[PDB]
Structure formats: C-alpha cells, structure tokens
C-alpha cells in the first residue's frame, strides 16, 4: 500500500501538527495562512521535519498515482 501523490502531501500534513504542543493553538489555525502558523511552528519542528522531510523524499522519488 503505497500513498498517491495526492495522498503524499496530504498524510504530512495531518502527520506536521500530530504533535499539537506548542503551536498547537496557532497551527490549528485553518483560517490561516499555512506560512503564517509555519513560522511559529519552528519550535515543534521537531515534529513538522519529520513529515516536511518525507514532502521532498517522495518529491525526488516520485509517487505513485
């Protein structure tokens, strides 16, 4: 079971703010800019690295779909 292109992007996504600790109030923030809530979430990047890192792994790989 390998994750489309469509899926790739969107697993990260829910995956990024699974951690909900520090910037969990500001990256909940669906009515706002991705990039606004993303530079608070520079503290939890411990975290957000883990998907973010997959976004190019499969980038450069490629994905099924």
């Given at each position: 079971?390998?994750?489309?292109?469509?899926?790739?992007?969107?697993?990260?996504?829910?995956?990024?703010?699974?951690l909900?600790?520090?910037?969990?109030?500001?990256?909940?923030?669906?009515?706002?800019?991705i990039?606004?809530?993303?530079?608070?979430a520079?503290?939890?990047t411990?975290?957000?690295?883990?998907?973010?890192?997959?976004?190019?792994?499969?980038?450069?790989?490629?994905?099924?779909?």
């Amino acid at each position: 079971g390998s994750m489309k292109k469509e899926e790739l992007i969107d697993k990260i996504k829910a995956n990024n703010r699974l951690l909900n600790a520090v910037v969990q109030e500001m990256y909940l923030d669906n009515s706002l800019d991705i990039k606004t809530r993303d530079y608070y979430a520079s503290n939890i990047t411990s975290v957000r690295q883990n998907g973010d890192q997959i976004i190019q792994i499969l980038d450069e790989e490629g994905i099924a779909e």
